[PDB]
């Protein structure tokens, strides 16, 4: 994965953040919310 | 200690962790009318009609209010009681101690700190070097 | 002031590469340099009827009067 | 001078100075030249007010003399 | 806790009690002056040591004296 | 022992510098008085004091230091 | 209306219920931080505190330390932060010996002598290895870059 | 022609402003 | 005053220029210019943008002693109950800051007492006085003769 | 006078209050060691015991082991002491399964079945990484020497 | 930092001991001592 | 001429004798 466009380091960090960090936080935060008393 | 708190919007100058750990101080007074008073911790609050209960961090803040409650209002509030409140629930009543304000002489009061001599009649520190006592003590 | 104390100490220890300077770890005032650039580009673009800049301290011409500088760009 | 003179007022305090004056009042009472207006040390605010006046008078006059002699010499 | 001592040169004009901001001082009956009262210090545990009483004392040298002793939470005047 | 052979020229060394904060400029600046390491020049005058009272070797100064360790004990 | 009120009802406690101090987002983010999260033993409180603190602490010495222009830039950034965590866990354990020595409370497990020592034990383990994993991601940055852009497929 | 690095990054900084207001609207709609 | 007199008179005696002292010490500008300004030249060039020499530690100590002497002026001019009221805001800030209010002091933070920072400001004054002059005494003499 | 007395006042307990066994320096050093320090949880006092023990344990096999004359001297010193800590924590954990099985005393937290297992858990983690940090200081000893003498400035 | 003097390995270990290990122990032990009951 | 390695190390072992006696004096003066 390369890029001639500017800020090509941004898909280097946002793809594993929207791909992993956003689902792990949100589904983690939803799992506490939907199963709380 | 019954009394509704005065109408105050809150301040950062009030009680710290000392109030719930060591001691805090409660001032209780009765007001004829709904009046505005300057809080000793910063800001201005409104006296409720009837009895007021205010918790303060120091005894000086309660007495700075009690000085203000006695001279900065057209009807003088001369019935304020000042308490020391402990976290265990025990309350020690402080001011006025005998029910009479201390600038007025009252019978039944015992003299503490009186020495029956002049301030220049204190003994020399050379006579009491290793007794540990100060010239004003012995 | 601790930035000053750092490179006072770093220059004293013979470490100019470890200082806060333009030949070392650079602290550029990039927002003030950008504002200076906007004022240099101000005549014509955002001040179209202004012939020259408001001040030459922002950038541009060096003004001489009697072989002596009146105003220069303060970089 | 006046910057250093300020630190007499700023660093010290009047209970030293009142005790010094009442020894000089004695030497005036010895020669019957003690004034009816009793000599007092400056008050605590005035001891600070004189010290902050002489500090800023001394420091600014230094910089004024430094700036004006330097900038008259150059050019 | 500081020590507040009251000496026999008291005239009983109650200015130390009125200058007291910590309710340390009070007037007790006495026989040594015309006002027939002497200042007393029953509550020196609340003494901050600020010496407003010594400022208000009109006698010479002083009839009330505050000696700064051991420092507690109350004497250091801490809200924390 | 290097200083007593030329007291007017050799700078007396107090002790060695061991500072990890030193760069290559300060190592070369403080490698002085004919030493092979960064040193501090003595200005207490103990070299002139020791040479006048008969001390001429580093063994004598070492024996004086060990004796003063014993004298402190 | 008015969004700055008295803090927890009492207007004489020296605090204010501000949109920074007592908002809905403040009460659910601070309260779910490791030092305040309900039900956590202090070994997991200290571990998650340690892993966060150890991870960014090699950063200043990696990019700005004295070894940043040698071949040991990531090594010198690690030893700087490893020795910082060692002072930091010594600051924790000396605090817990001092603060909790006369009696032990019951409301909070963290504010207890055995509880704060679990916090310091967790902070040490997460602090050093959180620094070490970021060191491992920085020495193998050429590996991690090739992972994240698919150079090994 | 092409966008710069400071144009892509500034678009992200402006994008906090819908992100902050979508958080406020979602919490207001939940209440 | 006396060590300035000892150093400047001996600087002319050792260099042979005794007329430098004898015709400039009679007024305080010659003390200011020919002694304080002139002999500090190799001191303040102990380090510069173009390198260092053996007077680099004395140049750093000279500025160190200026800092310690000027820091003592804070304890001698500014006094206690300014700082006690400042600490009370800092005490409030720690108590109301989450993740930091879990850490609590055992000793209550108060300002230094009235006697104490008169001693502490004097100690900074004296340590600042001595480290300034010992740097200037040595680097001007060792820069000229050493 | 006399410096050897009865141990803790009882002359019929089989011990003596000697300048080695019951001096003031002995009671404040032994009592402040991790195994005896007041208020420590067993996970931290296991950790501090492990960190000390893991640190010196690679040293014998580094300088005297069979790999000391190869290019893997520090690895063989580490591998020799990682497996010794693993036997040591197996010795601790099997001891706690044996010694504390019948009842749980209320006196000492360390002398309890769950308490001794926190001790073994701390000794394991401090033992292996304490061996690893000394391994890391030994493989990067050329870096550490250059740090300590300022070769990277 | 080098040295032509003997035992030049001794300032290699004593400077970070007097510099770091001596204050961290002493001010560590003082902090327990001045704040104990 | 110069001191040897065993001379510097012997001085440190001798220096443990004032190190132990200053510890005994300091604890005696504290009593
Ligand atoms: C909803 C519109 C939209 C969609 C469909 C995409 C889609 C994509 N973006 Mg994105 N982007 C958008 C808005 C959008 N973008 C906006 C307006 C910006 C300017 C600030 C960005 C900035 C941006 C960057 C800088 C990056 C991408 C990238 C990408 C790709 C991977 C996802 C990622 O890393 O996100 C990262 C995106 C962000 C951190 C910012 C997105 C902010 C938008 C406005 C949020 C939109 C939320 C949406 C309306 C709600 C949907 C709800 C629904 C799911 C229920 C993918 C092609 C990556 C890429 O190009 O990979 C090759 C990457 O590096 N985008
Ligand atoms: C959009 C999300 C997305 C992306 C970005 C990836 C990307 C990748 N996947 Mg994956 N995949 C995903 C979703 C995604 N996957 C899903 C939805 C599935 C189901 C279809 C799969 C199924 C799949 C399989 C079955 C496998 C992959 C693997 C791979 C990796 C190949 C290289 C490698 O060994 O990585 C190693 C990289 C990682 C394990 C990620 C961790 C790396 C970071 C740097 C560690 C950070 C830790 C640090 C301490 C915490 C940071 C703190 C923070 C505050 C910064 C690559 C990173 C392969 C693999 O080896 O991955 C394990 C593999 O076996 N993928
Ligand atoms: C941030 C920068 C900084 C730091 C911290 C250092 C650090 C040090 N330098 Mg230095 N140096 C610097 C900048 C700095 N320098 C600069 C800019 C220069 C100019 C180039 C120098 C020039 C220089 C020279 C010329 C020398 C050093 C030396 C030293 C070492 C001191 C050895 C020692 O006995 O310490 C112990 C420290 C002390 C005894 C002082 C402590 C004083 C405290 C404040 C008061 C006393 C303690 C108190 C009573 C109670 C505290 C509690 C206590 C009991 C724990 C040490 C490595 C010396 C050296 O190499 O050692 C042989 C030395 O000769 N350096
Ligand atoms: C003086 C200030 C200072 C300095 C100089 C640095 C400098 C550094 N920090 Mg740091 N940091 C600081 C302060 C500072 N920090 C502060 C105050 C914070 C807030 C607490 C942080 C938070 C922080 C984080 C959270 C991260 C950095 C990182 C870094 C490195 C980034 C360099 C880089 O881009 O290349 C190298 C790094 C990259 C190109 C980025 C890679 C990031 C990771 C490996 C990807 C994560 C993947 C995925 C999202 C994780 C999901 C896990 C999965 C299991 C779900 C660098 C060493 C990164 C780091 O340590 O990387 C090892 C990083 O992740 N720092
Ligand atoms: C040069 C002299 C000097 C210095 C160093 C100080 C220092 C300070 N003044 Mg100041 N002040 C001075 C003279 C000075 N004053 C004088 C002359 C007056 C009398 C009128 C005052 C009166 C005064 C007032 C009335 C106020 C201050 C305040 C402060 C603080 C400023 C904010 C701050 O913390 O900055 C950061 C600290 C510094 C810039 C100091 C230098 C720190 C160095 C760089 C750190 C070096 C690292 C360290 C030494 C490593 C430890 C090593 C170990 C061996 C100990 C700071 C503590 C203000 C304050 O406290 O508000 C916050 C305040 O209100 N000052
Ligand atoms: C009181 C006299 C004194 C002074 C101020 C110095 C000063 C110094 N020594 Mg030391 N030294 C001394 C005594 C002295 N030494 C004695 C008598 C010996 C012979 C055994 C040593 C052995 C020695 C070695 C082997 C080393 C130093 C080094 C150094 C430097 C850094 C500090 C250090 O690592 O100490 C370490 C010192 C020791 C481990 C032993 C010193 C023991 C002394 C006697 C303790 C003195 C305590 C004092 C009298 C009590 C007053 C304290 C008071 C301020 C509260 C510095 C120049 C280092 C050096 O040369 O760096 C380049 C170094 O490697 N010294
Ligand atoms: C006399 C004490 C002294 C000495 C010897 C040092 C020495 C040094 N300082 Mg320092 N400094 C000190 C006091 C001192 N400082 C003080 C008083 C100040 C305030 C003015 C400073 C301010 C300062 C700054 C601001 C910085 C330095 C840094 C540096 C280091 C530069 C190289 C590096 O990255 O180190 C890395 C080395 C370490 C962090 C030390 C750890 C190395 C050992 C081997 C780890 C041992 C761990 C092990 C498991 C435990 C051993 C057990 C034991 C029983 C043996 C160097 C070691 C810089 C740096 O990067 O250091 C962090 C830096 O940022 N100094
Ligand atoms: C039988 C007898 C006699 C004969 C004595 C004979 C035959 C010899 C006597 C020799 C003696 C008694 C020598 C004494 C030496 C004392 C010394 C050496 C003390 C030194 C103390 C200090 C504190 C020095 C510290 C320092 C040292 C260590 C240095 O290295 C340099 C720095 C300095 C500070 C100077 C006489 C006839 C009398 C009468 C009858 C009894
Ligand atoms: C969102 C948010 C934010 C931000 C955040 C941040 C700041 C971040 C950071 C982050 C971080 C900073 C993180 C960290 C990370 C870490 C990690 C994740 C680690 C891990 C670890 C591991 C992986 C492991 C390790 C180890 C090893 C390797 C071995 C030894 C041991 C151990 C186990 C330890 C804020 C605040 C603004 C607020 C708002 C919200
Ligand atoms: C003083 C004294 C003594 C001595 C002592 C000794 C013997 C010492 C030793 C020492 C030691 C023996 C120490 C040790 C050290 C260790 C350390 C300090 C470690 C730590 C660690 C760290 C740093 C970290 C780690 C890690 C990592 C890296 C990752 C993984 C995990 C962990 C976290 C673990 C005696 C006895 C004679 C007695 C008298 C007194
Ligand atoms: C010296 C000193 C004094 C003594 C100063 C006194 C008694 C005042 C001296 C006044 C003299 C008499 C005149 C001062 C100069 C006049 C302003 C000049 C007037 C203009 C002339 C031309 C008439 C203090 O009282 C004092 C109080 C608190 C802190 C510090 C100090 C302090 O440092
Ligand atoms: S010092 Fe203040 S509080 Fe104490 S007795 Fe005097 S006036 Fe009252
Ligand atoms: S001490 Fe002074 S103020 Fe108090 S009663 Fe006596 S004369 Fe009045
Ligand atoms: Ca470098």
UniProtKB/Swiss-Prot annotation, chain D:
The chain crosses the membrane at residues 49-69. Chlorophyll a binds at residues 8, 16. Phylloquinone binds at residue 17. It is found in: Cellular thylakoid membrane. Belongs to the PsaA/PsaB family. PsaA and PsaB bind P700, the primary electron donor of photosystem I (PSI), as well as the electron acceptors A0, A1 and FX. PSI is a plastocyanin/cytochrome c6-ferredoxin oxidoreductase, converting photonic excitation into a charge separation, which transfers an electron from the donor P700 chlorophyll pair to the spectroscopically characterized acceptors A0, A1, FX, FA and FB in turn. Oxidized P700 is reduced on the lumenal side of the thylakoid membrane by plastocyanin or cytochrome c6. The PsaA/B heterodimer binds the P700 chlorophyll special pair and subsequent electron acceptors. PSI consists of a core antenna complex that captures photons, and an electron transfer chain that converts photonic excitation into a charge separation. The cyanobacterial PSI reaction center is composed of one copy each of PsaA,B,C,D,E,F,I,J,K,L,M and X, and forms trimeric complexes. This is Photosystem I P700 chlorophyll a apoprotein A1.
Curated annotation (Swiss-Prot), chain E:
It is found in: Cellular thylakoid membrane. The keyword Iron-sulfur applies. It catalyses: reduced [plastocyanin] + hnu + oxidized [2Fe-2S]-[ferredoxin] = oxidized [plastocyanin] + reduced [2Fe-2S]-[ferredoxin]. [4Fe-4S] cluster 2 binds at residues 20, 47, 50, 53. Its main location: membrane. Binds 2 [4Fe-4S] clusters. Cluster 2 is most probably the spectroscopically characterized electron acceptor FA and cluster 1 is most probably FB. InterPro entries: 4Fe4S_Fe-S-bd (IPR017896), 4Fe4S_Fe_S_CS (IPR017900), PSI_iron-sulfur_center (IPR050157), PSI_PsaC (IPR017491). GO terms for biological process: photosynthetic electron transport in photosystem I. PANTHER family: PHOTOSYSTEM I IRON-SULFUR CENTER, PHOTOSYSTEM I IRON-SULFUR CENTER-RELATED. The cyanobacterial PSI reaction center is composed of one copy each of PsaA,B,C,D,E,F,I,J,K,L,M and X, and forms trimeric complexes. This is Photosystem I iron-sulfur center. It comes from Synechocystis sp. (strain ATCC 27184 / PCC 6803 / Kazusa). The gene is psaC.
UniProtKB/Swiss-Prot annotation, chain F:
Belongs to the PsaA/PsaB family. The PsaA/B heterodimer binds the P700 chlorophyll special pair and subsequent electron acceptors. PSI consists of a core antenna complex that captures photons, and an electron transfer chain that converts photonic excitation into a charge separation. The cyanobacterial PSI reaction center is composed of one copy each of PsaA,B,C,D,E,F,I,J,K,L,M and X, and forms trimeric complexes. PsaA and PsaB bind P700, the primary electron donor of photosystem I (PSI), as well as the electron acceptors A0, A1 and FX. PSI is a plastocyanin/cytochrome c6-ferredoxin oxidoreductase, converting photonic excitation into a charge separation, which transfers an electron from the donor P700 chlorophyll pair to the spectroscopically characterized acceptors A0, A1, FX, FA and FB in turn. Oxidized P700 is reduced on the lumenal side of the thylakoid membrane by plastocyanin or cytochrome c6. This is Photosystem I P700 chlorophyll a apoprotein A2. The lineage of its organism: Bacteria, Bacillati, Cyanobacteriota, Cyanophyceae, Synechococcales. It is found in: Cellular thylakoid membrane. It comes from the Bacteria.
Curated annotation (Swiss-Prot), chains H, L:
It is found in: Cellular thylakoid membrane. One of its GO terms (biological process) is photosynthesis. InterPro entries: PSI_PsaM (IPR010010), PSI_PsaM_sf (IPR037279). Keywords: Membrane, Photosynthesis, Photosystem I, Thylakoid, Transmembrane, Transmembrane helix. The chain crosses the membrane at residues 6-25. It comes from the Bacteria. It is a single-pass membrane protein. One of its GO terms (cellular component) is plasma membrane-derived thylakoid membrane. Belongs to the PsaM family. This is Photosystem I reaction center subunit XII.
């Amino acid at each position: 994965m390369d890029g001639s466009y500017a800020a090509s380091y941004l898909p280097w960090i946002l793809i594993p953040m929207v791909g992993w960090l956003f689902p792990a936080v949100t589904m983690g935060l939803l799992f506490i919310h939907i199963e709380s008393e | 200690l019954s009394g509704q708190p005065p109408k105050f919007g809150g301040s950062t100058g009030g009680l710290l962790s000392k109030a719930n750990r060591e001691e805090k101080y409660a001032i209780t007074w009765t007001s004829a009318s709904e009046q505005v008073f300057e809080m000793p911790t910063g800001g201005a609050a409104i006296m409720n009609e009837g009895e007021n209960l205010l918790y303060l961090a120091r005894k000086e803040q309660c007495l700075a209010l009690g000085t203000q409650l006695r001279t900065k209002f057209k009807p003088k509030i001369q019935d304020y009681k000042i308490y020391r409140v402990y976290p265990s629930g025990e309350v020690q009543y402080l001011h006025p101690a005998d029910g009479v304000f201390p600038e007025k002489v009252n019978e039944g009061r015992e003299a503490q700190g009186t020495k029956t001599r002049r301030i220049g009649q204190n003994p020399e520190p050379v006579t009491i070097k290793f007794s540990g006592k100060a010239p004003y003590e012995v | 002031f601790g930035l000053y104390i750092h490179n006072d100490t770093m220059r004293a220890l013979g470490r100019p590469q470890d200082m806060f300077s333009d030949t070392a770890i650079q602290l550029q005032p990039i927002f003030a340099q950008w504002v200076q650039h906007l004022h240099t580009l101000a005549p014509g673009a955002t001040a179209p009827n202004a012939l020259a800049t408001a001040s030459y301290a922002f950038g541009g011409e060096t003004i001489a009067v009697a072989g002596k500088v009146a105003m220069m760009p303060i970089t | 001078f006046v910057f250093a003179f300020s630190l007499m007022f700023l660093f010290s305090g009047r209970g030293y100075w009142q005790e010094l004056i009442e020894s000089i009042v004695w030497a005036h009472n010895k020669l019957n030249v003690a004034p009816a207006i009793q000599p007092r040390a400056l008050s605590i605010i005035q001891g600070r007010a004189v010290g902050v006046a002489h500090y800023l008078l001394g420091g600014i006059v230094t910089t004024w003399a430094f700036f004006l002699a330097r900038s008259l010499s150059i050019g | 806790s500081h020590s507040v001592k009251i000496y026999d040169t008291c005239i009983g004009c109650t200015q130390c009690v009125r200058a007291c901001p910590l309710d340390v001082l009070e007037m007790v009956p006495w026989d040594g002056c015309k006002a027939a009262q002497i200042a007393s210090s029953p509550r020196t545990e609340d003494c901050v040591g600020c010496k407003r009483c010594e400022t208000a004392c009109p006698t010479d040298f002083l009839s009330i004296r505050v000696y700064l002793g051991a420092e507690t939470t109350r004497s250091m005047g801490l809200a924390y | 022992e290097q200083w007593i052979k030329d007291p007017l020229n050799i700078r007396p060394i107090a002790h060695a510098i061991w500072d990890p904060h030193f760069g290559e400029g300060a190592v070369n600046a403080f490698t002085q008085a004919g030493a092979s390491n960064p040193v501090n020049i003595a200005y207490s005058g103990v070299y002139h004091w020791f040479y006048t009272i008969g001390m001429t070797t580093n063994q004598e100064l070492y024996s004086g230091a060990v004796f003063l360790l014993v004298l402190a004990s | 209306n008015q969004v700055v009120q008295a803090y927890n009802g009492d207007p004489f406690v020296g605090h204010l219920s501000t949109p920074i101090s007592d908002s809905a987002f403040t009460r659910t983010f601070i309260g779910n931080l490791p030092a305040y999260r309900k039900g956590l033993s202090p070994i997991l409180r200290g571990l998650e505190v340690g892993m966060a603190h150890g991870y960014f602490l090699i950063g200043p010495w990696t990019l700005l330390g004295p070894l940043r222009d040698s071949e040991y830039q990531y090594i010198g950034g690690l030893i700087g932060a490893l020795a910082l965590i060692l002072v930091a866990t010594a600051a924790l354990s000396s605090y817990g010996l001092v603060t909790f020595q006369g009696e032990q409370g019951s409301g909070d497990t963290l504010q207890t002598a055995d509880g704060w020592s679990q916090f310091a034990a967790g902070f040490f383990v997460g602090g050093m290895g959180g620094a070490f994993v970021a060191y491992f991601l920085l020495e193998n940055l050429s590996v991690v870059d090739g992972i994240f852009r698919g150079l090994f497929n | 022609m092409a966008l710069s690095d400071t144009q892509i990054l500034a678009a992200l900084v402006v994008a906090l402003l819908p992100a902050f207001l979508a958080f406020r609207l979602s919490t207001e709609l939940y209440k | 005053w006396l060590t300035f007199y000892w150093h400047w008179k001996h600087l002319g005696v050792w260099s042979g220029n005794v007329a430098q002292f004898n015709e400039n010490s009679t007024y305080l500008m010659g003390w200011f210019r020919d002694y304080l300004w002139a002999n500090s030249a190799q001191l303040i060039n102990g380090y510069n943008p173009y390198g260092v020499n053996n007077l680099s530690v004395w140049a750093w100590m000279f500025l160190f002693g200026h800092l310690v002497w000027a820091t003592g002026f804070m304890f001698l001019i500014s006094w206690r109950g300014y700082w006690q009221e400042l600490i009370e805001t800092i005490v409030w800030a720690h108590e109301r800051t989450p993740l930091a209010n879990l850490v609590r002091w055992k000793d209550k933070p108060v300002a230094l007492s009235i006697v104490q920072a008169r001693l502490v400001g004097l100690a900074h004054f004296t340590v600042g006085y001595v480290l300034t002059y010992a740097a200037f005494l040595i680097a001007s003499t060792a820069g000229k003769f050493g």
